[PDB]
């Protein structure tokens, strides 16, 4: 028996190569079974031919197999709450994908990989069954059936070694539950092994920090119930007993700070022990070296125990290292920012002597700009030797700024037209930017506000300002109530603290009036201008130019402006009439919003936002009406209207229109009007003040991929706006608008997504206190940064 | 969305209903709120028509046979103090003997109560609570603990005499090693695979044996129930391990005289050479003992809530959780009879003796029972 | 898909790196000691002549 | 998505893609190639093609991926040059990406990542093959990417110089020196040197710098 | 246009009593009034603005009420210096102004007699060519008085022109002068000139003349 | 003039005279290291030349400085001191 | 406090400038108007300006023919009247308006009155009106002094240049038929006096410049 010729069967990777190589002999050689063998064992090693037959016509070798190779494709069913992401991990780990395993012996141990994960979930009532769609020559699609009943439950978990102590009360911290309350109707009712051990680490500290240095744990045994459901716990302990802490006697390496080292340590006697107390000291100790500055420096405390009397001499050693291992820094993230951009804030600077807190504080001013995503540095030893020591700055930065648009229904032409848009780091600069304006059939505007910051190395902020509002009744131009003015505001802001900012500058603005409308607090500024028209028409006219003097103050301690959890932020702005000009008065106000989050979870949080404004005429005068304070517009407050607050229009019989569609317009002589008509429209005010009060809410079900891209919120929100001007002598016979009385009042929701496009809020709330005829919608929607 | 997407498997409903024997219950003296929707060790007792009751709770009950009228009622759960009032929350059966009443709870809190009144010989404290029901006898008192321990005890007193460590499972895992004896010695199973001969006169180990498959990460069978307790011959023992893997093995050394190792099984009593069991997906077997060789089956009643089984009237029985009740052919396994009186809960041993036949619910609580 | 007069050899933006500066080392004075030479920014010397930018080409044989 | 064919086909339907141009298709086509035929006899041009592809539809990070693949599967292959070369080249890309190029301005003000990146990639890439013909565009990236390096540090320098900090400045200096002599920014950042040094009365190295200048003033 | 009505013209009282000046509105004006005092030989005052609040520095006695229909000034214990005309002037519309006619505030005194005095002309008004001769009233009240002239017992009315002062600041009284024109020629033709007074202060008609070539 | 709010500024290579009483010629590099920390600066165009100096800088007018630089010779070995305060 | 300058007498149709200047007051921001009232108590508005050169507004009555203009700069008021009829003649006011309440005047100047007529000027004639001292002599007689065919009003007319005062009663001047003025000016003494007291009145005619001391003998007739 000699081999004449061989059929080297094997495919999809393979040729004659590989099966010859499984084969011993050639053409002209003796050949044997050992071959059959061979291939077998051969082919379960690599793991390509399911079988083997290597059979001889005569003495003419052949080969005929089935191959384990390509898995064509798999598919998942009933898979409900685990992914097939997972599953793939699964699979991978299993070794186990295309042009991989077969063999359907081995369903088993896939089907065991598969229940070992439900193994591992916390289940164990569950099956999965693989399916072969066969395909041709090798090739099979593997379905999976998923059978997931249900998981086991928590039951009871009882524990021994506890006299001192109930057991619910310290079940009470636990992520478990053996019940769930009533007061919180929904709570899981699940296990897991790590909640587990963060429940016995947890019973840990506490019986620490009452004091009990002889607690431990002597072992905690589940229930393994059959039925597939009951899971309790039985829990084996030491009670042990307090000690009381006695003294302290640290030692270690000090570079004379021995004095102010001490200091952290200083204590009463008589205070129980606790070791969350040491652990906390023991930090307090690093941060102040850190703040001489030193890397790694080591800490160990020792609890001397007197048994006899259960108490402690807590003996401490420690190491301190070097210093000034400041030599360089690295940034990563900036794809659009400039390096500077940076380091203006960075206190602390290369070439130096360290301190963490300077590192700190730059997080937090940089934060506190508000133009980044996420942050994170790190303090990268050096390797080339244990006495320097670089930095990164590796985080991630914000594509932001946005283009204004769009508005509540409305009129065909007057609901869009509407410029506004903001970089405010235009073009990756931190030059900062916002301009707007808007063409319309009966007004036009213009606005234009840019600021550099940093006109210094100091944080120099150079702001201007310039303004166009066209308004004449655009496209009429002619017998209508036209204001039409155009002005500058440019002014400057100094740094003066780490946290407080000023801001002084300028104004000079002109504005011109035509064919104006009889109303009350119009006629009695213009009195009190010194100019007394008609009281009748809408013929007439009156302009003005003059120059001011502005300037505020600001506190910022804050986390950031993306979206801020915690601190304060306050803008105070004042301004000024000054001499020589037309027109004499102030307006002033002030606008706070504060964070308070109950747990740093930074989840559950306070808001605190709120206005004051008040401004005056000087010499006795009055403030043109034009500067009035405005409320609502679901910027400010939401339920209502925009400008719609306060005191409100107030009209005569008019006796001018030069026109008469069908005197479709209100009140005149000439439509047969007499009998002074009071109105509704709204026309701002002098004084306002206005809260709102604010839960943040958790969102409800969404990925914290963005999830932590957005913002939500329950407000009760309120305020109110009024003049003290107002008077009764006339007024009488009329609703007085005097007195902070007609308080306004609403609740509701805050919904704030990011979207690339800028900050987009809608909203949902409903008014209570209403007053005389005020509009409003519920369902809104906007796009503006308001606070 | 989540609260309407469960899933579950089904067991098997009802057969056909028989009554050849028509079945009722003597009476039901059922009992205040007990155990709830639990497990446990738990079932009453009786003795000479005086009849041993108590809940989950606390609460304990003397009662008359014939009416279950209450001859007296006491309670552990403590009035004072501040332990949920000392709830009893119990992990072993009743045991009773002499004048006198012996209980252990999941405490390791161990009472001792003179009969007649119920009053407190003494409670004493051990390590780790019951998968077994306290074992007291031959003036020795007999722990299986939680903590994978013997506790030997006074039989007097509750003195410690003794105590043993044991391998623990890797889970802890639920089930139980229900400890009996022989001639003088100890003699137990073990969720770790193993089973033990020990001296019961100070707990000196005499042999052990390990019984099961080897396997791991596919721990011991779920399935493979109840009544994982020995079951003596002259010089044999007979029980599964908690696979379901069945050993008669030398009764002095553990050495096997057979095995029906390859059957999984879930509950059994022996009756001569005729061993009545439940099954794996709760199906029925009559067994032989030389190989678990099947004397009869009935698989009409599968997955189900069941207890051990038990004779009565020489027909063979048994019932559910769920009310369900069964007498059955000793012989080749068909229904007699067939009952339902509740919905309550049944996880405990069936009371078959002197005649009669007893149960206890969880709170749907004691049926005295005959037909 | 966006390409006009197709991606086969082209390149993509600009080119001033192809316009870009040339060099100047130093003759480094004597006496006064210039930093030595140090990292792998050496720049093996080319002996190039080779086709660049739009003239070179992109793709797999 | 879609049906099988033969992976010959599936080749043909890509060069047919290819012709056309269709990044789009010829993603979709082999996609379904490489997961339908995990390995083939050309699986090697299947990695070269999602690569080019990936070139022309930005898909940069898979193409990063796709790359190592091929690196650690075929760390022997002739055509390597193209291989390494478009990985740079990629690197380079990323380096410099924006729409701030419409604008005439200059990107000396970011990471120098991918920079070096390539720069260490292109190094590895000649001193293996100093013979093809992808050398002399990646010659003159080389010298741009010392040049951009360049910028970005006299950038720094000049940053702590309007701060008036002299000492990382110095370090910072005789890290670019032996980093390189030469560009028209170094001979910038002599006097600067210079300066910095002045201020803290360095006379002696005032007048070491000033015959550096001296020399090279140039 | 707007209509000030104001009534009566001239008003007399005692001290210490309290006067209610009426003033009507035509357009009942939603209360938009101002009341004006100008005293003779002086510039005009304020009195009220507001149509019923008091200007600074003045008075309380002075009060305003009334609507729009009609309005009314109540001044209380009003005293001696106080004799002014009173305006009422109106500004809710602003583009026209309507005044009062002005209210002539008088005293009541006791009925006064005039001491009569006739002058005769010069004699450089004969030179010229008038004659003048003046009958005159001193300090009487009330304003109203008949006094005709007698010519050679020829009663004559219409060439002759009197002018009467306003009540004096001191004794409340009136006087009158009624000048006689005639012509020098026509002045030397008639021998007796007389002038008769018929007043209320007066018991009965009193008659006093002169006779040429005397003085 | 006033200005305002002068930040605080620092740079490195100080601790104290006390270590400079501790030394004198003869030490090696290594013998400084052990005590000194590591040079920031040193001699890059001459011999091992090391810069021990205090800077910094306070707020509004007022300014720091203790400099000092140490000459090694061939061996790294100092041969000659200049220690000397602010100007 | 509130000055005014205008004219005396012209003749209808010509023109005339007054001017007001306001002292103790800003005479900025406030509302200043020109107010006539003609002898006959009838009461007229005739002008309005604003503080600023804003709104003016005028009478129907005098339409545009009149300019009403201020200088804060001088705190001066300018009133050009053209087109002028004999019916303009009256006592013109400068006006002010309340600041800070509006809707109405606050201060008024003492009044510039304005007489325009075709007719010249007339230098008076004084006749001396002697004491009627045949009622008695132990009593009270009056003497005087009659101002006649002078034009225009007014003429001051004391006695002794103010020295005399023994309740001095000046009639209105009346205007006869030929259009000039004619008063008499006479003053109540003690008939004792006469042979003890000179008088002399003192008359003074300002647009004719005509200053004439005419003494009435002391004879008891």
């Avoid at chain 1, 009943?149 to 992520?175: K, P, R, W, Y």
């Avoid at chain 1, 003066?496 to 000023?502: G, M």
């Avoid at chain 1, 209100?666 to 009007?673: K, N, R």
């Avoid at chain 2, 009228?69 to 992990?91: H, M, R, T, Y």
Wanted: hydrophobic residues 35%; proline residues 4%; charged residues 20%.
């Amino acid at each position: 028996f000699v081999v004449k010729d061989i059929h080297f069967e094997g495919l999809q990777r393979v040729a004659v190569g590989a099966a010859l190589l499984s084969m011993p002999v050639r053409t002209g050689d003796t050949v044997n079974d050992e071959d059959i063998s061979n291939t077998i064992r051969a082919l379960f090693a690599t793991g390509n031919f399911e079988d083997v037959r290597v059979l001889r016509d005569g003495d003419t070798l052949l080969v005929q197999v089935k191959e384990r190779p390509t898995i064509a494709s798999i598919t998942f069913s009933g898979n409900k709450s685990v992914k097939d992401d997972m599953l793939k991990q699964n699979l991978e780990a299993s070794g186990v994908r295309v042009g991989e395993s077969l063999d359907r012996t081995t369903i088993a141990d896939i089907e065991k990989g598969l229940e070992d994960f439900y193994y591992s979930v916390g289940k164990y009532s569950a099956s999965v069954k693989a399916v072969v769609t066969p395909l041709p020559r090798n090739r099979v699609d593997l379905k999976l059936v998923f059978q997931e009943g249900v998981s086991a439950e928590i039951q009871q978990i009882n524990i021994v070694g506890n006299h001192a102590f109930t057991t619910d009360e310290l079940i009470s911290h636990f992520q478990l539950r053996d019940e769930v309350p009533w007061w919180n109707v929904v709570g899981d009712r699940k296990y897991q092994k790590q909640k587990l051990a963060g429940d016995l680490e947890t019973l840990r500290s506490y019986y620490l920090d009452r004091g009990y240095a002889r607690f431990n744990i002597d072992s905690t045994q589940v229930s393994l119930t059959p039925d597939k459901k009951g899971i309790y716990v039985t829990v084996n302990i030491t009670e042990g007993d307090q000690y009381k802490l006695s003294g302290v006697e640290v030692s270690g390496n000090l570079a004379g700070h021995s004095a102010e080292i001490e200091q952290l340590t200083k204590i009463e006697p008589g205070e129980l022990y606790n070791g969350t107390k040491v652990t906390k000291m023991e930090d307090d100790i690093k941060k102040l070296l850190g703040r001489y500055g030193y890397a790694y420096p080591r800490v160990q405390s020792m609890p001397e125990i007197n048994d006899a009397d259960k108490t402690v001499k807590l003996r401490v050693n420690v190491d301190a290292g070097n210093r000034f291992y400041v030599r360089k820094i690295r940034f990563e993230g900036n794809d659009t920012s400039k390096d500077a951009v940076l380091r203006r804030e960075m206190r602390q600077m290369e070439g130096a002597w360290l301190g963490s807190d300077l590192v700190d504080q730059g997080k937090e001013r940089l934060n506190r700009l508000g133009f980044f995503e996420t942050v994170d540095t790190d303090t990268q030893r050096v390797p080339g030797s244990p006495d320097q020591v670089d930095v990164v700055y590796k985080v991630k930065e914000r594509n932001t700024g946005s283009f204004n648009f769009g508005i509540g229904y409305g009129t065909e032409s007057g609901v869009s037209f509407q410029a506004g848009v903001q970089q405010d780091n235009w073009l990756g600069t931190g030059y900062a930017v916002g301009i707007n304006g808007t063409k319309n059939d009966y007004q036009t505007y213009a606005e234009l506000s840019v600021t550099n910051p940093y006109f210094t190395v100091d944080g120099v902020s150079l702001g201007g300002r310039l303004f166009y509002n066209d308004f004449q009744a655009d496209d009429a131009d002619l017998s209508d109530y036209t204001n039409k003015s155009y002005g500058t505001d440019v002014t400057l802001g100094f740094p003066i603290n780490e946290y407080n900012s000023l801001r002084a500058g300028l104004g000079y603005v002109h504005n011109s009036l035509s064919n104006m409308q009889p109303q009350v607090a119009m006629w009695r500024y213009l009195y009190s201008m010194g100019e007394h028209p008609s009281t009748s028409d809408q013929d007439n006219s009156f302009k003005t130019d003059d120059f001011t003097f502005n300037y505020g103050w600001t506190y910022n301690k804050l986390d950031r402006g993306y979206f801020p959890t915690d601190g304060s932020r306050v803008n105070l702005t004042g301004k000024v009439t000054i001499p020589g000009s037309d027109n004499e008065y102030y307006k002033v106000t002030l606008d706070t919003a504060t964070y308070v989050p109950i747990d740093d979870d930074h989840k559950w949080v306070v808001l605190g936002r709120t206005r004051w404004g008040y401004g005056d005429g000087l010499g006795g005068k009055e403030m043109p009406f034009y500067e009035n304070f405005y409320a609502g517009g679901s910027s400010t407050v939401r339920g209502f209207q925009s400008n719609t607050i306060g005191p409100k229009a107030v009209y005569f019989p008019h006796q001018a229109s030069n026109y008469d569609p069908d005197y479709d317009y209100e009140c005149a002589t000439q439509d047969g009007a007499k009998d002074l008509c009071k109105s509704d429209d709204a026309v701002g005010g002098n004084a306002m003040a206005v809260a709102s009060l604010e839960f943040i809410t958790p969102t409800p079900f969404i990925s914290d991929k963005y999830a932590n891209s957005v913002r939500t919120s329950f407000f009760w929100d309120m305020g109110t706006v009024w003049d003290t001007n107002w008077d009764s002598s006339q007024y009488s016979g009329y609703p007085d608008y005097s007195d902070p009385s007609n308080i306004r009042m609403s609740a509701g929701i805050a919904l704030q997504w990011m979207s690339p496009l800028g900050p987009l809020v809608f909203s949902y709330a409903q008014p209570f206190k209403k007053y005389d005829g005020d509009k409003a919608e519920q369902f809104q929607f906007n796009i503006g940064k308001t606070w | 969305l989540f609260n309407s997407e469960e899933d579950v498997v089904k067991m098997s409903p009802l057969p056909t209903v028989e009554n050849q024997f028509t079945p009722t219950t003597a009476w039901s003296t059922s009992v205040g709120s007990g155990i709830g929707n639990f497990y446990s060790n738990l079932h009453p007792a009786l003795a000479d028509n005086v009849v041993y009751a108590a809940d989950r709770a606390g609460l304990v009950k003397a009662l008359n046979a014939d009416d279950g009228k209450e001859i007296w009622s006491v309670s552990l759960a403590e009035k004072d103090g501040w332990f949920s009032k000392e709830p009893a929350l119990l992990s072993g059966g009743v045991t009773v003997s002499g004048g006198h009443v012996y209980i252990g709870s999941e405490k390791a809190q161990v009472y001792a109560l003179n009969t007649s009144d119920g009053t407190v010989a003494w409670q004493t404290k051990v390590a780790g609570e019951a998968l077994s029901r306290p074992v007291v006898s031959d003036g020795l008192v007999l722990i299986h603990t939680s903590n994978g321990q013997l506790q030997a005890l006074n039989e007097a007193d509750g003195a410690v005499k003794w105590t043993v460590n044991l391998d623990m499972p890797s889970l802890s895992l639920r089930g139980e090693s229900a400890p009996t004896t022989a001639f003088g010695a100890a003699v137990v199973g073990g969720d770790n695979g193993r089973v033990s001969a020990v001296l019961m006169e100070q707990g000196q180990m005499i042999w052990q044996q390990r019984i099961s498959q080897a396997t791991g990460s596919t721990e011991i069978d779920r399935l493979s129930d109840v009544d994982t307790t020995p079951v003596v011959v002259n010089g044999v023992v007979f029980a599964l391990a908690y696979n379901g893997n069945l050993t008669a093995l030398d009764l002095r050394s553990g050495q096997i005289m057979w095995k029906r190792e390859l059957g999984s099984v879930n509950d059994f009593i022996v009756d001569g050479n005729r061993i009545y069991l439940v099954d794996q997906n709760d199906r029925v077997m009559a067994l032989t003992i030389d190989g678990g060789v099947t004397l009869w089956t009935q698989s009409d009643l599968l997955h189900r809530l069941l207890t051990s089984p038990v004779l009565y009237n020489g027909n063979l029985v048994v019932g559910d959780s769920e009310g369900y009740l069964h007498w059955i052919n000793v012989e080749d396994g068909r229904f007699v009879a067939q009952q339902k009186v509740d919905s309550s809960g049944f996880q405990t041993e069936p009371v078959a003796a002197d005649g009669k036949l007893l149960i206890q619910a969880k709170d749907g609580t004691v049926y005295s029972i005959t037909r | 898909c966006s390409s006009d007069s197709r991606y086969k050899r082209q390149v993509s933006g600009d080119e001033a790196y192809l316009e870009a500066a040339p060099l100047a080392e130093l003759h480094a004075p004597a006496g006064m000691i210039l930093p030595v030479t140090s990292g792998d920014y050496a720049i093996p010397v080319t002996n190039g002549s080779g086709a660049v930018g739009k003239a070179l080409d992109i793709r797999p044989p | 998505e879609v049906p099988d064919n033969p992976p010959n086909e599936i080749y043909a339907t890509a060069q047919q893609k290819l012709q056309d141009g269709n990044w789009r298709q010829a993603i979709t086509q082999l996609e379904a190639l490489d997961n339908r035929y995990p390995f083939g006899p050309y699986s090697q041009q299947v990695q070269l093609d999602l690569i080019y592809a990936y070139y022309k539809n930005a898909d940069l990070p898979l193409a990063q991926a796709a790359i190592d693949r091929f690196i650690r599967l075929n760390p022997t292959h002739p055509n390597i040059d193209y291989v390494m070369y478009m990985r740079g080249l990629t690197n380079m890309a990323l380096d410099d990406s924006a729409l701030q190029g419409f604008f005439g301005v200059d990107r000396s003000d970011r990471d120098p990542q991918h920079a070096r990146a390539a720069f260490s990639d292109f190094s590895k890439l000649v001193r293996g093959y100093p013979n093809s013909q992808y050398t002399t565009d990646a010659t003159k990236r080389l010298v741009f990417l010392k040049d951009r390096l360049a910028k970005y540090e006299y950038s720094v320098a000049e940053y702590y110089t309007e701060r008036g900090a002299w000492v990382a400045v110095v370090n910072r200096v005789e890290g670019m020196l032996r980093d390189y002599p030469d560009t028209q920014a170094t001979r910038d950042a002599l006097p600067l040197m210079e300066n910095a040094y002045r201020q803290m009365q360095m006379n002696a190295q005032a007048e070491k710098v000033a015959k550096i200048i001296a020399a090279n003033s140039s | 246009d707007i209509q000030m009505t104001q009534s009566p013209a001239s008003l007399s009282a005692s001290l210490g009593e309290t006067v209610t000046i009426e003033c009507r509105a035509s357009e009942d004006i939603h209360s938009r009034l101002a009341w004006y005092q100008q005293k003779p030989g002086k510039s005009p005052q304020l009195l009220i603005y507001n149509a019923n609040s008091l200007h600074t520095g003045v008075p309380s006695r002075f009060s305003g009420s009334g609507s729009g229909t009609q309005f009314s000034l109540k001044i209380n214990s009003l005293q001696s210096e106080d004799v002014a005309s009173y305006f009422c002037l109106q500004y809710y519309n602003y583009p026209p102004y309507t005044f009062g006619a002005g209210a002539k505030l008088e005293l009541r005194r006791t009925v006064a007699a005039p001491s009569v005095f006739i002058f005769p002309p010069s004699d450089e008004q004969l030179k010229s060519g008038t004659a003048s001769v003046v009958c005159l009233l001193n300090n009487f009240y009330p304003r109203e008085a008949k006094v005709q002239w007698k010519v050679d017992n020829a009663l004559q009315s219409g060439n002759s022109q009197e002018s009467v002062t306003e009540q004096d600041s001191k004794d409340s009284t009136y006087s009158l002068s009624s000048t006689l024109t005639l012509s020098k020629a026509d002045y030397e033709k008639h021998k007796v000139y007389a002038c008769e007074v018929t007043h209320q202060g007066l018991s009965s008609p009193v008659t006093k003349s002169f006779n040429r070539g005397e003085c | 003039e006033r200005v305002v709010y002068r930040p605080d500024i620092n740079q490195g290579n100080y601790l104290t005279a006390n270590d400079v009483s501790k030394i004198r010629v003869g030490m090696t590099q290594q013998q400084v290291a052990y005590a000194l920390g590591t040079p920031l600066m040193s001699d890059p165009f001459g011999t091992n030349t090391w810069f021990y100096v205090f800077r910094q800088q306070p707020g509004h007018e007022g300014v720091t400085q203790q400099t000092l630089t140490l000459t090694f010779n061939s061996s790294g070995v100092l041969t000659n001191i200049d220690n000397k305060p602010a100007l | 406090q509130l000055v005014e300058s205008g004219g005396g007498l012209v003749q209808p149709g010509r023109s005339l400038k007054l001017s007001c200047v306001a002292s103790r007051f800003t005479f900025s921001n406030y509302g200043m108007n020109w107010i006539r009232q003609t002898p006959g108590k009838g009461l007229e508005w005739v002008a309005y300006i604003g503080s600023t050169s804003s709104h003016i507004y005028y009478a129907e009555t005098v339409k545009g023919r009149f300019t009403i203009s201020r200088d804060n700069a001088k705190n001066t008021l300018y009133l050009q009247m053209t087109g002028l009829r004999s019916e303009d003649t009256a006592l013109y006011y400068c006006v002010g308006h309340v600041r800070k309440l509006g809707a109405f005047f606050d201060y008024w100047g003492q009044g510039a009155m304005v007489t325009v007529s075709s007719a010249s000027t007339k230098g008076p004639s004084v006749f001396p009106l002697a004491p009627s001292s045949k009622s008695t002599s132990g009593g009270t007689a009056a003497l005087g002094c009659l101002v006649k065919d002078y034009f225009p009003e007014p003429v001051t007319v004391s006695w002794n240049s103010g020295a005399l005062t023994s309740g001095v009663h000046t009639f209105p001047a009346v205007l006869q038929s030929s259009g000039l003025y004619s008063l008499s000016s006479v003053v109540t003494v003690p008939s004792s006096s006469l042979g003890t007291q000179t008088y002399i009145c003192n008359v003074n005619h300002k647009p004719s410049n005509t200053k004439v001391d005419k003494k009435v003998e002391p004879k008891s007739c």
